[model samples]
Target: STGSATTTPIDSLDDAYITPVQIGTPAQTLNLDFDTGSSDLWVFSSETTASEVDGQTIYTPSKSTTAKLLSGATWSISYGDGSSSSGDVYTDTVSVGGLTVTGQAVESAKKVSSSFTEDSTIDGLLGLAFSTLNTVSPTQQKTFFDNAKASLDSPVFTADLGYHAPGTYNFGFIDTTAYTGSITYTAVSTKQGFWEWTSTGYAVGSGTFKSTSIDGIADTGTTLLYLPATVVSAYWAQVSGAKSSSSVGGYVFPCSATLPSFTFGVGSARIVIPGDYIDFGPISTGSSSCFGGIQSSAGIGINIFGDVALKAAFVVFNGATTPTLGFASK
Candidate 1:
């Protein structure tokens, strides 16, 4: 429609996040936070303002009779933590699981406060994380894989991350039952959208950083897992009771147990970073006891690969057959 909408590159599109797909009959599920830096697909409607819809998850355009409203085309979005939301623009008919796409463009917020509306278990945000840094406009909108890519069977969209439970995140097939065959793809550079690569370095439990030689980009709109502060200080100087603190603005390391095993090197594929995502739940910090792979975003140069390194593997974002990227094995 916008020339068949296509733009894909994610790896340095900082803090990106997106996941939500609901509308009409027998289809109801929401897990948003996808941000192409900003394209717009807000949620939290039901005449919000109950403390800004605390813990989020509200979208009932009368349950969709083809929900529509774009009269004034109202919209508002702001982040950097201050958090904000305002809205009044709706089209209708949008589904993500069983794929339904009709008219599709949405934003139903009456207002949404930051911290993502108190994290009612995350059910808002699907930005696809991009950036020339945006504020919404025809600056290329309509994602969710561009209207579910005509009911995807395989236009690809994978984001599996759930160390203990909530992480399956699939869209448009490509589960090959935990992969092993066809997948080692990569090819996208139509003038930067963030998914550039060239790593051939980094490894931890088996040791190998070889004086570091990275060239980054692999972001899912960032959640945590940025590197190159000398590879996060040489992976916290090899884990054993690691120590480092402060999160959200930089460094994060804490380990009491479970920490080894890290490897990264695209092109010839080699990605692994599992240790409960590096003791990711026991929390703690400073004196060491928090491990979620690597952290610290310094000046935020590049190198992201968040979602704890995309839940160990099997990511494919094939921007419609070409602008490729399909790495299997999970």
Candidate 2:
């Protein structure tokens, strides 16, 4: 499954949220979505009618001094979550960090939802994940990376997620200061938009779970780490009375005891998710069993090692040179 595509992050203004982008020249602020699930930079515009857009932010070209509309083209996106929106095409000078790229294509939403229309915190999203999923053309757009690749010191971009705080998410040039220099690089499959790689299986309490071998994809758009059914079940079996809590919406176990350290092997590099990361909460059940951080993806089919897993390491997405993925530590 593509998972909750529509449920990904968006910046909200009033109640309608939009992803914000720091674009070129005057540093125009554009609302967009940073969809790792897909790679296209689109925004809502004034030409869009209220009914055509739902749960989205509308950008008025007249309001932005740096904005330019792409005549004769319109776009509509239907997400996996069943939410959809449509709008006109536009272009602008887009910038992020110290880097600025001009004449960038964008979409402006005409119709949106209350979830997006009502919130006022952010303007729009900036999709930074993969080039294959981009909504722009060549059919597949590499808007951010493609434009900035030439100027970047390295043909790489790393996302350093802050420690559960404001301004935690920082993108652009790789922050070498945040990495330990020990990195594991993997060749990415060009056929798929995802950063897919094979997992050597999982390790629990220093012992390898042999049956857990599988292929895994790293996604920053998702909040939880999803594993195959057998691997998920085997992981929980190690914990005493570790059972699924329907109320919690995921896996839950006693939060009192110290949970064992676990690792997901990606080639020769083994990324460890500490026991403290598995300790979810002291739920209403009164028993504080450290909840199993990994969950079953029996019905889902695809294995996704989301942000919960990625945040533990420094991740790099290299698209300029050869397609590749790398991870290091802070």
Candidate 3:
């Protein structure tokens, strides 16, 4: 089986991307974030506290004839942003694009953080990481991709993210039209349950490419690109008036300053992120100080090649016995 879906940014800054998902017998459709960084297909559900519910859509397992309670099963997860959710589990028919999976674990949220409550654009998260990362107690659950891979023509999915426009996510096969040139493949480290890979090096604007290894995870859930302080400082140093601000909580620069492009390697292939994409936006509604989309990951433990970097290439998550990642310029 194969599936494809259109993912769109929820806001102008492209803080996150959301795609449509169908759950239950009647197919309660909800917009969910496809997070490859975590492994729990959780949702805003009927069991969620009424006070926590905003304008977001909720999934009601009671309405689905195929739904069954996973007795004694429960799950909880906390995000890097400090938002969290905990819930009971249910097995239900779930579909994405045109692909369907029977008896998929559909975690229904009972409690959610205020951060989730405020973002009405997202209903929940559809985890694409390895099942080993699943938060369910006693019995870990497989991700939709993991469950659907057995029947797919090929056990892989592709992500083609656009700057400020809609993007495509495809499963089972790769669309050659989505990218230009050949793909660069690399081994992924699944021991950590993330699509973690190492980059050969990077370059600032039109500067020389630095041939140093940088290990990081390809995280679709995160909004910004985070690298070591040395690399981040090297890039920001080229921009006039860019500085690390304790008050601003990271790197910030004058909005009027012309930012430089960032380039990172996928093996020998280099993907360039345009300068405009690095200027995230104003720090405040009408402020002249702009926050950079790329920041230091010194304190984050692992560097994150998030949407800011992914938007520059066509990415493939190959879920074979020995998993691999493919990156191509588009």
Candidate 4:
């Protein structure tokens, strides 16, 4: 069977996309971040310390008859930003937009980093990356997508992220009407437990497209796009007041500066991100300098095609025997 759900950004800056997910018997609803960059469906639960919990809606296992503790199993996960969370495990019935998965490992958070608590809109994360990246120990758990794939009409899911608007995530079947033109299919490497692939090249605005092979991962969890320093420098150079600011962190420029559009190649096709998308937002509450959406991936060790790029097109995470990714203009 196929299922679909709308994922909405939390704020005007499009920091994170959130989708409503149902957990347990009576079904407690929580707005979860459908992260394609990580694996591990964890949530703020009653098990979480009050100090760690802010305004997030917590899941209560004692309130659900279907919830069962996964004895001796525990999980801990950390992100590149230094945000981390650790918790015990529980098996329960989980559903996303009506797609149900029984015996789903719902990691109940006992501890969470400051960032997680600071952002009250996100209750937890629903990992869509490879289950091999699952942090559960003793016995790794399968992601919701992996567990539901067998019963799905198709072993694929699509991400249609939006810019300051609500987007959609579809499971099992692709909505042909959702995107325009045709899809460009590319082989995916799950060896690193990520939806990793290579791009043909990129161009700053209407500039010529270089024939460089750029390696990156399509990450819905990440807010900004991170490319090689050379590529990033090339883009920012076009803006009059753009500079790498140490105070604001990363690149920033005059809020009134005319920014250039960014184009990345997917096989022979090109996806263009409008200049305004790169404007990001002001550094501080009323600062005149604005942070850029595209930054250098120098210290990151890897290029990240995050929401800034993903929201520009339609992305398919195919989980067939030989996994592949499909990209199309929307």
Q: Is candidate 2 or candidate 4 better by TM-score?
A: 4
Best to worst by lDDT, what's the order?
3, 4, 2, 1
How would you encode candidate 3's per-residue C-alpha lDDT over 215-287 as one tens digit per residue? 9999999999999999999999999999999998899999999999999999998999999889888999999
How many pairs of residues in model 1 come into backbone collision? 34
List the lowest-lDDT window of 10 residues for candidate 4: 276-285
The TM-scores, one per candidate, come to 0.35, 0.76, 0.99, 0.99
lDDT of 3: 0.95
Candidate 1 all-Cα RMSD: 14.9
The lowest-lDDT stretch of 10 consecutive residues in candidate 3 is 273-282
| lDDT of model 1, residue 125 | 64
**lDDT tens readout by residue for model 1, 147-213:** 6666666666766544444444566666677666667776655355555555667777778645345
**Clash pairs (backbone) in predicted model 4:** none
**Model 3, position 107: C-alpha lDDT score:** 96
Error of 2 at 235 (Å): 2.5
- Candidate 2 lDDT over 126-184, as tens digits, reads 65656556554324345665666676666666654433421233344555576785778
